[PDB]
From a paper:
The catalytic power of [name] is thought to stem from its ability to facilitate the deprotonation of a carbon next to a carbonyl group to generate an enediolate intermediate. Glu167 is thought to act as the catalytic base in the initial, rate-limiting proton-abstraction step to generate an enediolate intermediate, which is further stabilized by other residues in the active site.
Elegant studies by the John Richard group on the protonation state of the Glu167 side chain show that the pK changes from ∼4 to ∼10 when forming a complex with PGA, mimicking the protonation event of this glutamate upon substrate binding. The structures show that in the PGA complex the postulated general base Glu167 is protonated, while in the PGH complex it remains deprotonated. Moreover, none of the residues in the active site show any significant geometric changes between the room-temperature and 100 K structures. The atomic resolution structure of LmTIM with PGA shows a hydrogen bond of 2.61 Å between the carboxylate group of the inhibitor and Glu167.
Author numbering: 2 to 250
Amino acid sequence: AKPQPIAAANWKCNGTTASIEKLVQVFNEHTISHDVQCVVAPTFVHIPLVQAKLRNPKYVISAQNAIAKSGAFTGEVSMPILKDIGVHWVILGHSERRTYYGETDEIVAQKVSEACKQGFMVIACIGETLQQREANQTAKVVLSQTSAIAAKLTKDAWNQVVLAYEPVWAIGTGKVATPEQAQEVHLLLRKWVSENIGTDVAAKLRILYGGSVNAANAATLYAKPDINGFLVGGASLKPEFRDIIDATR
């Protein structure tokens, strides 16, 4: 009944040629025997290296960010440029970009809309801060983030969308959400999608959890009915990513 799971490696701003070659070999030698979409998101400058070395058939390569259009945007990489180089997945609205790099709900929504129009699969990130959770604002926050994205999408565009719920207080902190905490948010997100977008859209939508996922906590998170896989930061730089993938069996 669950849709196809996703196991996504957000390498963030990390890697050398040598370390990437070693880790890609690890990923290649791990034979995956179930239906799962694996994703690796290296830094922009490492995309060609990963494209040349990654051969595991369960994997696609994703960018960690993009802007919508080419032009006079020194330092940025656009969606047409990624498409031309063969990258058709992108992570958008990651908490680090919302916090450090000026990505408001509306800016994220515009990027997601443009990526969908350009044929990308999009991992769109949402999630509340510790302060918002303590103020009992978790649902209002994640639904505001999601509805801002939804307002710029047609119903058919949702076939390209994957949501990643990452409580900000769980990102890199060693304080993973409990299975109950994660499931509660995934449930309310799917209910909103069901009632506002469509029951069919909601049944097919992948909602991933991220924030301190590791190989030992992944299977119990995946056992929850509304969790469809993981967006993985620190543990995706390590060979234990193999067991995180296999925790989606």
